[PDB]
Design an enzyme around this catalytic site. Structure first.
Site, PDB file in Angstrom:
ATOM      1  N   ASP A   1      45.514  12.322  35.208  1.00 12.17           N
ATOM      2  CA  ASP A   1      46.092  13.125  36.279  1.00 12.17           C
ATOM      3  C   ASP A   1      47.602  13.233  36.205  1.00 12.17           C
ATOM      4  O   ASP A   1      48.325  12.362  36.701  1.00 12.17           O
ATOM      5  CB  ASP A   1      45.663  12.495  37.598  1.00 12.17           C
ATOM      6  CG  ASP A   1      45.985  13.343  38.801  1.00 12.17           C
ATOM      7  OD1 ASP A   1      46.745  14.318  38.645  1.00 12.17           O
ATOM      8  OD2 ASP A   1      45.483  13.026  39.892  1.00 12.17           O
ATOM      9  N   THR A   2      48.104  14.354  35.630  1.00  9.87           N
ATOM     10  CA  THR A   2      49.540  14.554  35.507  1.00  9.87           C
ATOM     11  C   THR A   2      50.223  14.759  36.857  1.00  9.87           C
ATOM     12  O   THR A   2      51.445  14.602  36.945  1.00  9.87           O
ATOM     13  CB  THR A   2      49.838  15.705  34.541  1.00  9.87           C
ATOM     14  OG1 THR A   2      49.259  16.899  35.063  1.00  9.87           O
ATOM     15  CG2 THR A   2      49.300  15.438  33.151  1.00  9.87           C
ATOM     16  N   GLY A   3      49.462  15.118  37.877  1.00  5.04           N
ATOM     17  CA  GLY A   3      50.003  15.289  39.222  1.00  5.04           C
ATOM     18  C   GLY A   3      50.138  13.991  40.000  1.00  5.04           C
ATOM     19  O   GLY A   3      50.625  14.026  41.141  1.00  5.04           O
TER      20      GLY A   3
HETATM   21  C1  LIG Z   1      50.869  15.402  44.627  1.00  4.25           C
HETATM   22  C2  LIG Z   1      50.011  14.217  44.171  1.00  4.25           C
HETATM   23  C3  LIG Z   1      50.385  12.927  44.932  1.00  4.25           C
HETATM   24  C4  LIG Z   1      49.885  11.616  44.343  1.00  4.25           C
HETATM   25  C5  LIG Z   1      50.848  10.685  43.881  1.00  4.25           C
HETATM   26  C6  LIG Z   1      50.400   9.452  43.305  1.00  4.25           C
HETATM   27  F1  LIG Z   1      51.291   8.558  42.908  1.00  4.25           F
HETATM   28  C7  LIG Z   1      49.052   9.130  43.149  1.00  4.25           C
HETATM   29  C8  LIG Z   1      48.100  10.045  43.600  1.00  4.25           C
HETATM   30  C9  LIG Z   1      48.510  11.285  44.170  1.00  4.25           C
HETATM   31  S1  LIG Z   1      47.229  12.381  44.684  1.00  4.25           S
HETATM   32  O1  LIG Z   1      47.469  12.652  46.018  1.00  4.25           O
HETATM   33  O2  LIG Z   1      45.962  11.887  44.181  1.00  4.25           O
HETATM   34  N1  LIG Z   1      47.521  13.785  43.813  1.00  4.25           N
HETATM   35  C10 LIG Z   1      47.046  13.912  42.418  1.00  4.25           C
HETATM   36  C11 LIG Z   1      46.020  15.059  42.330  1.00  4.25           C
HETATM   37  O3  LIG Z   1      45.796  15.426  40.983  1.00  4.25           O
HETATM   38  C12 LIG Z   1      44.646  14.869  42.984  1.00  4.25           C
HETATM   39  C13 LIG Z   1      43.726  13.844  42.328  1.00  4.25           C
HETATM   40  C14 LIG Z   1      42.531  13.694  43.185  1.00  4.25           C
HETATM   41  C15 LIG Z   1      41.347  14.411  42.861  1.00  4.25           C
HETATM   42  C16 LIG Z   1      40.228  14.326  43.689  1.00  4.25           C
HETATM   43  C17 LIG Z   1      40.298  13.498  44.838  1.00  4.25           C
HETATM   44  C18 LIG Z   1      41.477  12.788  45.147  1.00  4.25           C
HETATM   45  C19 LIG Z   1      42.605  12.878  44.332  1.00  4.25           C
HETATM   46  N2  LIG Z   1      43.960  16.210  43.113  1.00  4.25           N
HETATM   47  C20 LIG Z   1      44.047  16.947  44.243  1.00  4.25           C
HETATM   48  O4  LIG Z   1      44.694  16.565  45.219  1.00  4.25           O
HETATM   49  O5  LIG Z   1      43.320  18.119  44.085  1.00  4.25           O
HETATM   50  C21 LIG Z   1      43.490  19.212  44.989  1.00  4.25           C
HETATM   51  C22 LIG Z   1      43.030  18.747  46.380  1.00  4.25           C
HETATM   52  C23 LIG Z   1      44.940  19.698  44.897  1.00  4.25           C
HETATM   53  C24 LIG Z   1      42.569  20.345  44.524  1.00  4.25           C
HETATM   54  C25 LIG Z   1      48.565  14.722  44.276  1.00  4.25           C
END
Ligand SMILES: C[C@H]1Cc2cc(F)ccc2S(=O)(=O)N(C[C@@H](O)[C@H](Cc2ccccc2)NC(=O)OC(C)(C)C)C1
Lengths: 99, 99
Positions: A25-27
């Site tokens: 997960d790059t995000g």
């Molecule tokens: C901005 C990021 C903030 C964050 C920062 C971190 F240090 C760890 C996790 C996260 S997260 O909140 O998990 N995420 C990563 C996302 O890659 C996330 C991964 C994921 C997938 C499924 C369930 C829970 C988390 N996808 C995500 O939010 O997908 C949508 C809702 C944008 C479609 C967003």
């Protein structure tokens, strides 16, 4: 390897003597794993994303193996809906985005 | 380009003739942008993230440039903490993960 993005980039990881499936997960700034035991000291942390924040336990200096690549770093443990490999460990395995 | 992950993979996108900052997010199935005006009809969608769910507006076939690469696809609009480019558009621009 080269991983396409037609489906979720799920890989097997080895952490705390257990095998788990996790999302590259790059995000994610941080690596977040579902409830499990890890050795050593921990401190509480709040992490946020879509839907708001969750409380996790922060364990430092944890060894993980991702696709035959060993790394060490902080692992957050808590009620995440999916196991996530974040940038703090993706950098260590030399993972980049390319287009 | 080749983007390393020591920093967040933030890029400039263009949508509705305006430049915005967005995160290249392999952990996101979909592309989600903060509140803005988009043309046409929208459909309802529920997306699940780290801390729960957000209701979003789904717009299809939206013209969007990502790091100078042209894409046309689904854009979700809602209360996301950061603009996220998900796999639906990362595949359009030929993005892969490599290590
Ligand atoms: C901005 C990021 C903030 C964050 C920062 C971190 F240090 C760890 C996790 C996260 S997260 O909140 O998990 N995420 C990563 C996302 O890659 C996330 C991964 C994921 C997938 C499924 C369930 C829970 C988390 N996808 C995500 O939010 O997908 C949508 C809702 C944008 C479609 C967003």
């Amino acid at each position: 390897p080269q991983i396409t993005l037609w489906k979720r980039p799920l890989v097997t990881i080895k952490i705390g003597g257990q095998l788990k499936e996790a999302l590259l997960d790059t995000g994610a700034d941080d690596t977040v794993i579902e409830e499990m035991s890890l050795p050593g000291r921990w401190k509480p942390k709040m992490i946020g994303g879509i839907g708001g924040f969750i409380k996790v336990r922060q364990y430092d200096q944890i060894i993980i193996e991702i696709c035959g690549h060993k790394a060490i770093g902080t692992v957050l443990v808590g009620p995440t809906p999916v196991n996530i490999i974040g940038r703090n460990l993706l950098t260590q395995i030399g993972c980049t985005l390319n287009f």
